[PDB]
A paper describes a structure:
More recently, the ten-subunit ‘ER membrane protein complex’ (EMC) was shown to insert TA proteins whose TMDs are insufficiently hydrophobic to effectively engage TRC40, the mammalian homolog of Get3. In addition to TA proteins, EMC mediates co-translational insertion of TMDs close to the N-terminus in the Nexo topology (defined by a translocated N-terminus). The membrane subunit EMC3 is in complex with six other integral membrane EMC subunits (1, 4, 5, 6, 7, and 10) that together contain 12 predicted TMDs. The seven membrane subunits of EMC associate with the cytosolic subunits EMC2, EMC8, and EMC9.
Recombinant cytosolic subunits and subcomplexes were screened for crystal formation, resulting in well-diffracting crystals of a nearly full length complex containing EMC2 and EMC9. The EMC2•EMC9 structure was solved with experimental phases from a single-wavelength anomalous diffraction (SAD) experiment using endogenous sulphur atoms for anomalous signal. An initial model was built de novo and subsequently used as a molecular replacement search model for a native crystal diffracting X-rays to 2.2 Å. EMC2 is largely alpha-helical and contains a curved tetratricopeptide repeat (TPR) motif buttressed on one side by EMC9. The core of EMC9 consists of a small β-barrel flanked by alpha-helices. The ~1100 Å2 EMC2-EMC9 interface contains a network of hydrogen bonds and salt bridges, explaining its high stability in vitro and the absence of any appreciable free population of either protein in cells. EMC2 and EMC9 both contribute to the formation of a large, relatively shallow and moderately hydrophobic cavity that we term the cytosolic vestibule. In this experiment, we used a substrate that contains only the TMD and a few flanking residues (termed TMDSQS), allowing us to be sure that the crosslinks are to the TMD. These findings verify that the cavity can engage substrate TMDs and map an approximate binding site that spans both EMC2 and EMC9. A combination of H189E, L190E, and Y191K (termed HLY*) in the region of highest substrate crosslinking showed reduced insertion by this assay. The partially hydrophobic character of a TMD favours binding to the cytosolic vestibule formed by the EMC2•EMC8 or EMC2•EMC9 complex. This vestibule is constitutively open to the cytosol, is shallow, and is only moderately hydrophobic.
Residue numbers in the entry:
A (entry chain B): 2 to 33, 42 to 194
B (entry chain A): 11 to 281
Write the structure that this text describes.
Amino acid sequence: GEVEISALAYVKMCLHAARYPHAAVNGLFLAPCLTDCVPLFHSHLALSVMLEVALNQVDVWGAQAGLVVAGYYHANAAVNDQSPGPLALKIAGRIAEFFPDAVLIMLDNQKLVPQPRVPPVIVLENQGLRWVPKDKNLVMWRDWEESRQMVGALLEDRAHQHLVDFDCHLDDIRQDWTNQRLNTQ
Amino acid sequence: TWEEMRDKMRKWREENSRNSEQIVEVGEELINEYASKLGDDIWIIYEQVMIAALDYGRDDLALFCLQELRRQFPGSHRVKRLTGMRFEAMERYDDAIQLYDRILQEDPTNTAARKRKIAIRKAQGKNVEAIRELNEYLEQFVGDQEAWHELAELYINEHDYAKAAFCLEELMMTNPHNHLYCQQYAEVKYTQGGLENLELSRKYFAQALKLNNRNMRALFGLYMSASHIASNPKASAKTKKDNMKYASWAASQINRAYQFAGRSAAALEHH
């Protein structure tokens, strides 16, 4: 069915990919409507042990905030490639085990700094063990125009260098991977 | 010569600034209105402006600085570096590979150039070629530890965990007291999976932790490896009971890490 991507989720995802340009990055979307976003890793994404730890932390953090893990985003390092590799499909498929309607979002991290006219994203849905792109009419945006401009202005203010993902948190566990300085509001 | 401008360019170079906007703004003003006065600093400033122009999207200015530098220092390694940077910024990846290839023909162990070729191959989606090229290099320069680490990471990206584990064994054998290589070796063996790999992973996570008691990745890995071992039916009751002990030891160490972290973070927010 339809999925509404919130401003906060889209911005933090873009800020993640922009803090680590030219790297693959991934993350999770949460929903009670994709309302929030947990940036995951920017290196060695295909190793499973810290991903396992991250999935559990966000699950119980979500469960206490009345949220469920509802999606996964992934930006490929290859610049012409917006198609999900086996890692993206594996993780997204596992997430759909606990949430059948989960979405897999491929992010074009090449179309970020000049924010394009149309969202630089492909949204895929689970269709019996295969992931297939959603009809574009089924993907809705809470003020797409406003989400465009805030990413531009916040990147201009180097705000992405204050963005914390789980990799950063592992380096120093005092760092907040919920990014509670969501001063974008 | 406006001293305010020439000295600002000095401290920006010395402090490795990232303010490409201001560096282009002052530097371009210096090239066009005060070149007669810059004296000895002219060529560094030309190079400084070119780099910042590339990142700020002033390719007209970058090309001018590049052409002038090429004229003053023909054949130089540093102009080649700038030429390669420009090709990369324009996504002229093939031209970039050609440039980095003849640097490495003059210096097979050049680390910067090899590192640039690897980034380009990832941008190109040619990780497989990158793996073949790193292998050819390591057959002739087996002592290059950083190149072994680059290859390890390439194999992980390609999900070839046994080959990555092999590369990390070279790094552990040459750096037996480096906690990071033990920790990454353990993550790779954990990902390969199975009880035997999981027992191995627990042990190297324990070695990384003993090598550096503050490696959070090692602590979590020890907990996660030990907990899976303790729930695996194949394991002995001796191995299971021993790993249940490892896991709630790890769990309480994890429990304590977050409290010390959380108390430290509140002394930080209270200035």
